[PDB]
């Protein structure tokens, strides 16, 4: 009968204290975690965080919620979650998180005759992960989600990944615009505080930046402008107007390039590899113009010898600089 | 075994009036406070604020909540905090704030047999600290959090740092790319308003800005452009096209640099140390072009003498300007 299920549920909830952990004096409750990643939307370098949407399921056991005579698993309305005890799980990394709430609060309570309870939530979390952008844009980030209980120590609650390494699903399918998820790892541990030792789970992704876009847009304009700065040398040294105009316009173009990549870079105030490369190229064009300064000073007060010396040295020096840069940052 | 705790909790909250603080007519209630700084996410000079995430623990004595026969501490669910009195603390210098609420309201209540209550929250606060950016980016800032009691005067409540200087922990966890904490400080005092005298606890941090990024990105290009302006002296005096193009294009490059650091650096509308350096460099570049104009008027309308004098003066004057600048601000 349908009313029989209503009476069973009312009996289960009657005399139920939400404030008391299951087996309040007994051993700790073993909560099995499970995640299905729906999307990792943003990976913000400027904010040094990433947005992640997940179906987060928690399985545990409550003898108070055991029932008999109803063979089915009672899938109840989400509002019943208010009247039950649920674990004290929270994320440490989250700058801002929320449970999706449209048309209902996106929660599920599924009871079972054995007493085991499944509690599922659709959660979007802006987790904070540090990024070592010293080698930017050739870097290997490692962004993690940390799961812990706020109130209950390891003596009261116990966490584990349900399904072992198969606990987390969806990493294989999710694709990022600017990164590739090389690997994901599941870790379980205990962390000691002043209050006590708490359980912890950790889902750590390793992200490798895809490099087929910065070379197309960042390095090549600077390299070609430096090459034009070298083209300055092959012009005859008596044509002061032509050489000076070429050199100073190349300097202006490099300044524009630097300013607008600063506008279109992550804009984190500390030095990165791309900054070093851009300043190297800027110093190269500046030295190219100062070379003609030397040439004009010497000729009016041989000079073609200096021009040939520059012709052989500047491409070679820049090739050496490029080799050093591309070996150091690889 | 488990019900007995239920009647203990029920009789604890039976006859308990949250509207009255402990010892309503008696002496003031002492509230100790601890803070564990998870991180300082941002320090914005545009908005003159910083975002701080922390575990904020309060600790006080409530004789109405004393229980016997259960020697263990009762770590109750966060919802129990709705039925208890709490110190009504706030932060004076807040702009926008919240308590993290992913999967549970991140709060903890722990009762002790002697009536002692330990309350705990996980709070993100966008606190306001005004910054004196006259020395920017060579500046040192001081940002503070001002914990205070709103409704209860000094004769109703008393604040102190639990553990003294050890009350605040996790400053090691603070990791700002463009700042480094040189010191943190705790202060306790009283502040008088029209409604009465209230207790105040101040948590202050001194932050020193790292200037590697600024030196690399703003100072050096403006110096290289000034050197290129000096290069005009060595060229000639009759090659008017080359020298004029060099000088005016250097002026254009300085204006471009100033505009594109204005529109990319944080927007604080008043004078700063970097602005003085940039305008000094602009003045030097402008005076190089005026020097060539004077030379051209003298020659067409001794020119080599003026060129030599400018050669042995402009680098010297710029070095003097740098020495004055880099000693005033350091």
């Amino acid at each position: 009968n349908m009313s029989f299920v209503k009476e069973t549920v009312d009996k289960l909830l009657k005399g139920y204290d939400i404030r008391l952990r299951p087996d309040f004096g007994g051993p700790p409750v073993c909560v099995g975690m499970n995640i299905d990643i729906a999307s990792i939307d943003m990976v913000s370098e400027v904010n040094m965080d990433y947005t992640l949407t997940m179906y987060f399921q928690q399985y545990w056991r409550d003898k108070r919620l055991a029932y008999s005579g109803i063979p089915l698993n009672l899938t109840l309305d989400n509002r019943v979650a208010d009247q039950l005890w649920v674990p004290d799980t929270y994320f440490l990394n989250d700058k801002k998180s929320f449970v999706h709430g449209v048309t209902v609060k996106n929660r599920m309570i599924r009871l079972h005759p054995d007493g085991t309870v499944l509690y599922g939530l659709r959660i979007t979390t802006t987790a904070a992960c540090m990024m070592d952008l010293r080698r930017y844009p050739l870097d290997e980030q490692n962004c993690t989600l940390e799961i812990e209980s706020y109130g209950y120590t390891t003596d009261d609650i116990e966490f584990y990944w349900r399904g072992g390494d198969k606990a987390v699903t969806g990493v294989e399918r999710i694709e990022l615009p600017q990164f590739s998820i090389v690997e994901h790892r599941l870790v379980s541990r205990n962390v000691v505080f002043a209050t006590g030792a708490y359980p912890r789970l950790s889902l750590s992704f390793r992200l490798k930046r895809n490099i087929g876009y910065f070379i197309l847009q960042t390095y090549m304009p600077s390299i070609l402008i430096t090459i034009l700065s070298w083209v300055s040398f092959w012009i005859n040294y008596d044509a002061s107007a032509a050489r000076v105009a070429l050199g100073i316009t190349t300097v202006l173009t490099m300044t524009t390039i630097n300013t607008h990549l600063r506008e279109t870079l992550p804009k984190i105030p500390y030095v990165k590899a791309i900054d070093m490369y851009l300043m190297g190229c800027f110093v190269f064009v500046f030295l190219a113009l100062l070379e003609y300064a030397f040439v004009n000073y010497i000729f009016f007060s041989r000079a073609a010898a200096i021009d040939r010396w520059s012709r052989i040295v500047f491409p070679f020096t820049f090739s050496l600089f490029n080799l050093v840069y591309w070996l150091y940052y690889v | 075994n488990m019900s007995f705790v239920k009647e203990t909790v029920d009789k604890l909250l039976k006859g308990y009036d949250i509207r009255l603080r402990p010892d309503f007519g008696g002496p003031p209630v002492c509230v100790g406070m601890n803070i564990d700084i998870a991180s300082i996410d941002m320090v914005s000079e545009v908005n003159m604020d910083y975002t701080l995430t922390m575990y904020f623990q309060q600790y006080w004595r409530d004789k109405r909540l004393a229980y016997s026969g259960i020697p263990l501490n009762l770590t109750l669910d966060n919802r129990v905090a709705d039925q208890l009195w709490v110190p009504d603390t706030y932060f004076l210098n807040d702009k926008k704030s919240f308590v993290h609420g992913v999967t549970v309201k991140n709060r903890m209540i722990r009762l002790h047999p002697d009536g002692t209550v330990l309350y705990g929250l996980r709070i993100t606060t966008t606190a306001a600290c005004m910054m004196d950016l006259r020395r920017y980016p060579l500046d040192e800032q001081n940002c503070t959090l001002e914990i205070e009691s709103y409704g209860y005067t000094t004769d109703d409540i008393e604040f102190y740092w639990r553990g003294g200087d050890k009350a605040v922990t996790g400053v090691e966890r603070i990791e700002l790319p463009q700042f480094s904490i040189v010191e943190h400080r705790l202060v306790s005092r009283n502040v008088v308003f029209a409604t009465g005298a209230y207790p105040r606890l101040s948590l202050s941090f001194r932050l020193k800005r790292n200037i590697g990024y600024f030196i690399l990105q703003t100072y050096m290009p403006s110096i290289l452009i000034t050197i290129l302006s000096w290069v005009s002296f060595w060229i000639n005096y009759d090659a008017s096209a080359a020298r004029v193009a060099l000088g005016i294009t250097t002026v254009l490059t300085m204006t471009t640099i100033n505009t594109h650091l204005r529109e990319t650096l944080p927007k604080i509308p008043y004078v700063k140390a970097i602005d003085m350096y940039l305008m000094g460099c602009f003045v030097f570049v402008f005076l190089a072009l005026l020097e060539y104009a004077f030379v051209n008027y003298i020659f067409f309308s001794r020119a080599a003498a003026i060129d030599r004098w400018s050669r042995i003066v402009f680098p010297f004057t710029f070095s003097l300007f740098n020495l004055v600048y880099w000693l005033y601000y350091v």
Partner: nanobody
Amino acid sequence: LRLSCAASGHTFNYPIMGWFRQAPGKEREFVGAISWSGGSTSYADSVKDRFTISRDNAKNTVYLEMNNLKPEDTAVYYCAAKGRYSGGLYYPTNYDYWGQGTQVT
């Protein structure tokens, strides 16, 4: 006296370097801690002023300088590294990688 600990590898993932001490009788105790970035130092009460920990990131090293030596300082010292999210500094369990001990007397 002077002692040092050099670290290499994924230093970014483990920014905090902890110095611990162990005598033959007592267990591992906390001596000090230093951040790899910012050079912020934390000390134990007993060695708050006698010992100092400093940072040198060019060589990726942490230097423990010892002054006002007592015979009670006779012990083995351990260099360890802690993850970004691993709780308090004072607990050896939170520290993942443990260096080889150095006996001093």
